[PDB]
Assembly symmetry: C5
Homo-oligomer: 103 residues x 5
């Protein structure tokens, strides 16, 4: 299995690593129909989302999608620094695939 | 693919954005039959609710409803400031569709 | 929908509002068969339970019961002040229907 | 329903109350097959387990078993004092049936 | 039932105990398809994973896997020191079977 977020991210197409080294600036969570999602921003101006489950997701990802939202909420509340984000860049805002936190 | 809560809020009918910029004053949680909901208030005087799951909610929203209630609780306990709320105004009290937090 | 715990409590038969305005003194949790419940007490000596799910509960209450237990545990751990409790008084200890927390 | 852990505990076969009045010393969590359990110890030398779900547990206990594990982990992480433990003593280590906390 | 992580670890083949006595340095979480896993590292250079659920896992382990990921996240966020780890060493990075922490 991969050992780093960078190694993991490269196993996929349409992904990009973003070096954030910062805490989340804003957290947005929606339960509005068809938009059950979370959007996070950074002081840097970059915006990312955890996508609404859909056709392209494999079953195994459903639980992971819920976990990611859980992680982003607590990471935001605790003002924890995010190291890197592996994101799918064929979505707008970019879609979070993986996250890493250091220290 | 909204980038902000206001943009997200505009995709729905009967919604409005409330700029709160404050922590939740009261948190009320009910497990009474047909009243399984959460109600929050702000010192401003606004009261909002996370509705009881009903026939108007699609299947994707069920988990989102539970997530929102989780978010409101932890947000209240941590005295975290809420920035904006996207709410449905055809309900009394207004029903939360999305929340955003900043700082 | 109700806007306050008092308004909400008044919608049911066999309920009464207890003004606590204090943190929980003790938290008891049981996983013993047929006694899967939580019991909380206050300095005042007042004691309350979240009932074991039974035939009197409607399906929609099942997840609300679990949420209420989650809520009591975290408010206990955080020393959070409980404002009022809406409880059914035809059970001993009185059974928690709704809880409100405020400044 | 019982009003205290002592009363609750007395309702079962093969159980005894342990007055611990101390925070958990060590927390062990296993996800190894047929050993998905939690083990906790105290300075006094007492060791207790939350049993792996088994053929002796009724359905309603399944959710309670998972809750108990959640409770022990957060109690450990928060250095919260455990008041008493009601345990089944026909198991080694003794199996947790209920726990109470005060302070 | 085993009484210590060391005893529990011994019951398995291809396992090994790691004495860490340190907080997690970094936490990486992935929801990328087929890589829904968590990777943690320590200052020492040790890297461990919570494997993606697969054909090697039995019924009861599925919930335990999710629990372990929850634990690692909260342990990381709280900078809680990890004492020992029981890992399967026929995986790269080594796969976590059990974790123990002492306060
Ligand atoms: O990553 C391999 C899988 O790709 C998706 S399509 C892909 O899905 C991710 C979320 O997993 C993002 O939404 C990307 O934006 C989107 O392009 C396929 O449907 C799967 O079959 C795999 O090929
Ligand atoms: O928002 C589009 C959907 O509207 C609901 S009705 C709508 O439901 C929300 C919660 O999703 C709030 O309760 C509002 O008060 C209520 O008006 C429809 O039933 C769906 O078919 C969509 O049209
Ligand atoms: O509250 C209306 C419902 O009353 C219950 S009986 C009631 O149930 C609550 C929990 O909802 C407590 O256990 C009370 O002690 C108990 O009396 C009915 O079963 C429902 O049909 C509603 O009528
Ligand atoms: O407690 C009454 C029930 O006892 C179990 S056997 C009992 O189960 C608990 C967990 O509920 C512990 O594992 C004890 O060590 C074990 O002896 C029966 O199977 C049920 O029939 C009830 O009688
Ligand atoms: O541990 C006994 C079982 O071993 C697995 S194979 C074993 O699985 C663990 C997770 O349970 C790790 O992935 C190890 O790397 C892997 O080798 C068998 O499939 C089961 O039948 C038991 O024999």
């Amino acid at each position: 299995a991969p050992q780093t977020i960078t190694e993991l991210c490269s196993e996929y197409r349409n992904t990009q690593i973003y070096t954030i080294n910062d805490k989340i600036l804003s957290y947005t969570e929606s339960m509005a129909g068809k938009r059950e999602m979370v959007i996070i921003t950074f002081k840097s101006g970059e915006t990312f989302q955890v996508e609404v489950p859909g056709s392209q997701h494999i079953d195994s990802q459903k639980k992971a999608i819920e976990r990611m939202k859980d992680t982003l909420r607590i990471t935001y509340l605790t003002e924890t620094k995010i190291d890197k984000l592996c994101v799918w860049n064929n979505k707008t805002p970019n879609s979070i695939a993986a996250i890493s936190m250091k220290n």
